[PDB]
RNA sequence: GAGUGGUGGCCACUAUUAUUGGGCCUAAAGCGGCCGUAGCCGGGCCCGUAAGUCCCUGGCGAAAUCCCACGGCUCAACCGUGGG
RNA sequence: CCCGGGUAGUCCUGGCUGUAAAGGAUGCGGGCUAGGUGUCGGGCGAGCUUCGAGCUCGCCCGGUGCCGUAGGGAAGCCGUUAA
């Protein structure tokens, strides 16, 4: 049955990017999914996006732009603490500021090097590069 | 997929995404009241009324009309049932799981050797149990009710 | 087979139970726990 | 597109032939509907789509 | 409006298709009729012969290379090398002429034109992997793997593919500046045809 | 000062040092040059000129 | 760098091209090596390399990675035959591999030098280590990854004079392209040489398939093809 | 548990059989004429240790990691082995 | 090189114990098939709580042992004063 | 091994035994990732018709086969019925 929502979104991502989509339909969508695209549209990782609602949870339709090598969700989440973050960069990421982690604090959720200018930490719950 | 045949069936309805009662439907919320009780009174189902509604007096699903006395929800027909004491005691789908079990239980007393048959009945009792469990746990039994077919 | 399991945050007991399980499918760390060279051995665990 | 799903089922407005009462039906029916004056059938179920034996006035949204 | 009248276009059989179809070549589908035979949309055929026309004159002469490998196809791109001075190879294909350049006659063009994808398979993917710009006739059923300009047309005819290539040569020739009006071109479209 | 390193106009993409990519003149007006990456290639995807709007392979 | 100008100069006026990219070097057309790659043209004649990277001709920068004898039986006998798998680079940007066969080593060794030429890539470098940021081309700029048969390999970026960590093959291949540091990680079987030097050439053929930003081209100091002091 | 042991203070290399450190070690050898290759393997691991610093503090932040990075560049330059105007890297 | 060899033990080699990070069509390996109890994993929105989780700050986790700079034995090993 | 005979067994009623190359040598649930072409069940549209619960064509859902793109693999090969 369906469990996470949040990694099918991710997983469909990476899988059309790689065949040249230009958009996408997030089915099932909620607030957590909204925050993530928030994050990565800031950074340029996707286009714009919009809201569609039916009489279900909504659907998320999602405009791409080819700049993605990869992304994925981090299953369990893991709690970091605000001077760990290096050990977690090696774990996922290509160099030493490629890409970014994505982390959820009582503050909302923001990448990690955010999080870090803030001094804070919390749970770690997907990378994108 | 199916919870034991493991297929993969997809019919089922298609409900448009609407939030305000169609113009065309002229009926208010008295008369599709009166019009449950009658056929409750009929002695009909709850899922039988709604496609009765649907199909001769042109209701799509009652849901479409705020509850009265309770703003915060919509209306349904068993909250409608209730408010006059047509609700039936017992859940409709596990007393027709029930009917469906006690029917089976004298076949197999004139033929022992249906070996096929009984595997539908353990299914159909371990649906029963699941059920059971489940309105136990909301409140909906009391907590010694239990499922006996020597009954 | 699907992914390896389990993979759940509370699951710890059974991932430290199941490798604990497998382990002594493994011939070298059985022989040294047993100590089965010991009882064995006609010089006794000396070099010479 | 097609993300929202849509029915392809449709609610009639019809005439009966005996009684001339108007009523509103569903295109799909479970059970056979019949006038609501004169009792006289109007659409017989079938499989998929009924069978209308009365006259077509409209076909509502 | 149109380079010759429609007419003549259904005459000739262009808008025939076959029994199959693609769904990448579904955007040139007009209808399907009652037989199961699908049918081609004739405009979107002139539209990209003219967009061709001009895409191929500015290009050198004698840089064109076009080949068939089908019968009916043989006279009408010899006739239309005759007539731009482009090359033509009708027949069987050699293998490894673009890309042996030990053969007696390797050749290296700047852009081809295949009749037929199916059937002209050797020449396309020789042609490939020397990176150079494609033009293919397409019919109902081939895909468009591989082709950068595409013109919607039935290539299995015999009339077809005469009227074809005589509108793409006498297009080619007014863009290039060789004759001054469309009617100035006066060659039969039967000369382009094989007989019997 | 360096080179530019030329982008599929389909997919925006870099191309890489020896794939079968291609590259020609805007067939409709003839000012731009249009570049088809190997997947892009591969899948027909259609492509769209910066400066005349004609479009489609 | 003398002698390789007088060197391509004198193989330049006694060749006779016989492709067309072939007739574009001949002319003048085209006069850095940078110019032939990224547009699909077809490599048919070793001259072409010769009068562009003259300095791949040095003995120093040729290396010959193995030497094999195979043989097919008959009912008279073993017929035995030379495979011998072979690199050439300039030591700053540009790297081929090649594989030859003959009936003796010789023959074998020079075919397999000229399709070394043939099969010629370029590549990225910089420096993108977590405890070195210098922004010069001495390593890998991210961490990429190849494979070929049974191997896979994963190139790392390291610290600047820390050597090259990883197996010899991957040394040799690594040094004639102009790069100094880095860490690795290997699984299947390395000992099948022709599949190893394979995955570390794909390795770092890859790192023209990773997209990027051009803050990242100054952050970590991205070259490509020759580093042009 | 065990109480201290001194330890040696160089590094042997893995394999000592390899044709070409041997070569480069033959040189320093006799351009500086030392006596044995223990003592050159010696100043190789001061060398390393400096380097294996440097690396460590690159990537470090906070209040004793600038401690640590002027007292090395002090001691580094009070040796004669760098610029008075030197820089971590 | 005042050392250099032999035998036995532990770690590495080894992603041959795999959380990071392995396998199960044909090479070792999917129960003959299914139902279900504990356990583990669990759909969308709103309000509350603050156990888990994150940040700040008090009291603790002896000395010796480990890392760094300066100082005393010729330098060092060793020892002392400070910072971790 | 081939030929002429032949007891148990093979068949029915009530129990026990729980084993097979019991093999798709492939555990089960969910989301996603080019196409082409047969066939079985239901539904929808159009055209024929001897008016048949009939025939032909197209589309949707669910089963059951073959060829094949990206990807995977030591390869044989698998490839929306995924390995
Ligand atoms: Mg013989
Ligand atoms: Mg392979
Ligand atoms: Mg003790
Ligand atoms: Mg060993
Ligand atoms: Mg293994
Ligand atoms: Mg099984
Ligand atoms: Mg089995
Ligand atoms: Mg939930
Ligand atoms: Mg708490
Ligand atoms: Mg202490
Ligand atoms: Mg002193
Ligand atoms: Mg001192
Ligand atoms: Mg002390
Ligand atoms: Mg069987
Ligand atoms: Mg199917
Ligand atoms: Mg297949
Ligand atoms: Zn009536
Ligand atoms: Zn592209
Ligand atoms: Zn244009
Ligand atoms: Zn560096």
Known sequence: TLLDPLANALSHITNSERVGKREVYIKPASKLIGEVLRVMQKYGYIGEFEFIDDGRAGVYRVQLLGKINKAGAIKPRFPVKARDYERWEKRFLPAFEFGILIVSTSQGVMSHKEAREKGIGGRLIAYVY | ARMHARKRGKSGSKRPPRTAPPIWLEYTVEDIENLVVKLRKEGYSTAMIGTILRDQYGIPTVKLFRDPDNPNRKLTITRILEKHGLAPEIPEDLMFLIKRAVNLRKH?????????????????????????????????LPKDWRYDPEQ | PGKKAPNGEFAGRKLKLKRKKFRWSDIRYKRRVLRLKEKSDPLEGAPQ | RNVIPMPRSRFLRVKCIDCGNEQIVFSHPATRVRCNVCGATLVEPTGGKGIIRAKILEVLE | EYLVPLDQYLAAGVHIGTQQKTKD??????????????????????????????FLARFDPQSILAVSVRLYGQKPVKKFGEVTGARAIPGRFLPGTMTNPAVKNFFEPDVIIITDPRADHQAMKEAIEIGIPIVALVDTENLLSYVDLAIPTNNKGRKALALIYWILAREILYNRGEISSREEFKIPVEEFEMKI | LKFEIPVCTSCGREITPREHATHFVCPNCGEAIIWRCETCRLLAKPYKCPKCGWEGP | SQEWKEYAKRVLDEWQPKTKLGMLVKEGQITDIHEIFRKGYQIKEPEIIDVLLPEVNARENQEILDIALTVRMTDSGRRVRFRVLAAVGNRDGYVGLGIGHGREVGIAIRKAINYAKLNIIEIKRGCGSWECRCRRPHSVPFTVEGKEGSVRVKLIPGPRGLGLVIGDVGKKILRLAGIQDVWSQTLGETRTTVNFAKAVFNALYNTNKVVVTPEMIERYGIVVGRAMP | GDPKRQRKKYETPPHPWIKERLDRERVLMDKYELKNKKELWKHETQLKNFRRRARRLLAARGKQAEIEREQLLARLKRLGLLPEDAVLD
């Not at chain 2, 004139?110 to 649906?127: A, F, N, T, V």
């Open chain 2, 108 to 140: 197999l007393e004139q033929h022992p050797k249906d070996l096929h048959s009984m595997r539908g009945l353990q299914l159909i009792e371990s649906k029963i149990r699941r059920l059971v469990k489940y309105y136990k746990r909301k409140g909906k």
């Open chain 5, 25 to 54: 070549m579904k955007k040139f589908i007009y209808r399907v009729r009652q037989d199961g035979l699908y049918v081609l949309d004739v405009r979107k055929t002139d539209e990209r012969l003219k967009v061709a026309g001009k």
